[PDB]
Structure formats: structure tokens, C-alpha cells
Scaffold this active site. Structure first.
Site, PDB file in Angstrom:
ATOM      1  N   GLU A  58       3.392  28.735 -14.727  1.00  0.00           N
ATOM      2  CA  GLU A  58       3.181  27.818 -13.584  1.00  0.00           C
ATOM      3  C   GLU A  58       4.392  27.839 -12.700  1.00  0.00           C
ATOM      4  OE1 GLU A  58       3.924  23.542 -14.040  1.00  0.00           O
ATOM      5  OE2 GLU A  58       3.936  23.737 -16.052  1.00  0.00           O
ATOM      6  N   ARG A  77       0.764  23.175  -8.406  1.00  0.00           N
ATOM      7  CA  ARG A  77       1.251  24.487  -8.979  1.00  0.00           C
ATOM      8  C   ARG A  77       0.297  25.633  -8.820  1.00  0.00           C
ATOM      9  NH1 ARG A  77       4.665  21.139  -9.233  1.00  0.00           N
ATOM     10  NH2 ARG A  77       5.590  20.184 -11.043  1.00  0.00           N
ATOM     11  N   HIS A  92      -0.873  17.814 -10.697  1.00  0.00           N
ATOM     12  CA  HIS A  92      -0.562  16.645 -11.519  1.00  0.00           C
ATOM     13  C   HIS A  92      -1.230  15.427 -10.748  1.00  0.00           C
ATOM     14  CE1 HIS A  92       1.897  18.265 -14.534  1.00  0.00           C
ATOM     15  NE2 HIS A  92       2.804  18.679 -13.647  1.00  0.00           N
TER      16      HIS A  92
END
Ligand SMILES: [Zn+2]
EC number: 4.6.1.24
Length: 104
Positions: A58, A77, A92
């Protein structure tokens, strides 16, 4: 239009390609940037349907369009594999703790 949407961030295929290029080159060089050392291995415990094989890595993609150079990585990412193939774009944003959801 956005080729990938992470929360409210919009990315084009050019923004993905530029970020992947930079993260893959650090991988080839055995180098990392940032407090959290990116790029680093990604484990698919959430079971996203990536059509490219692991190992996966990532690397941050920034809303600003700048390539990540250290500093806050933000929540988004790009994930690439050992053969420099794009696996996906994840975030996220909207996921609990350190988990992720896919960008759409
Ligand atoms: Zn852009």
C-alpha cells in the site's frame, strides 16, 4: 467525473498511475518515506476482490494530486503487487480503526 471516489476525494486514472509509479519505484529501491514507512506490505484480510495476485503493497495517494513525500499520508491508498500491477484504490475513510473500504 471521478474514476475513483474515496469518501469525498476524487481521483482520475492519471492520479492513480502517478502515485503507483512513485510507490513502485521506492519498492524497487528498497526505500520508504514517512513515519509509517510507505510503501509497506498490505494484507487482504477484508477480502477485497482483487484480480491481481499478492504480495500487495500500500502507498498513499493524496487528494492534492502531489506525490506523497513524507508528512501526513491522509486516508487513501493505491495497492499494487510485486509485478507493478494495480490491485485497487482503498481508504480508511468510513472504516473503523485501521480497516479499509474500497473507493468506488
Ligand atoms: Zn487529480
Amino acid at each position: 467525473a471521478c474514476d475513483y471516489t474515496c469518501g469525498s476525494n476524487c481521483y482520475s486514472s492519471s492520479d492513480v498511475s502517478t502515485a503507483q509509479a512513485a510507490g513502485y519505484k521506492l519498492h524497487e529501491d528498497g526505500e520508504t518515506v514517512g513515519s509509517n514507512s510507505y510503501p509497506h506490505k498490505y494484507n487482504n484480510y477484508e477480502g477485497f476482490d482483487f484480480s491481481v495476485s499478492s504480495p500487495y503493497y500500500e502507498w498513499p495517494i493524496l487528494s492534492s494530486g502531489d506525490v506523497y513525500s513524507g508528512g501526513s499520508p491522509g486516508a487513501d491508498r493505491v495497492v499494487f503487487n510485486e509485478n507493478n500491477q494495480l490491485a485497487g484504490v482503498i481508504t480508511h475513510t468510513g472504516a473503523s480503526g485501521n480497516n479499509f473500504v474500497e473507493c468506488t
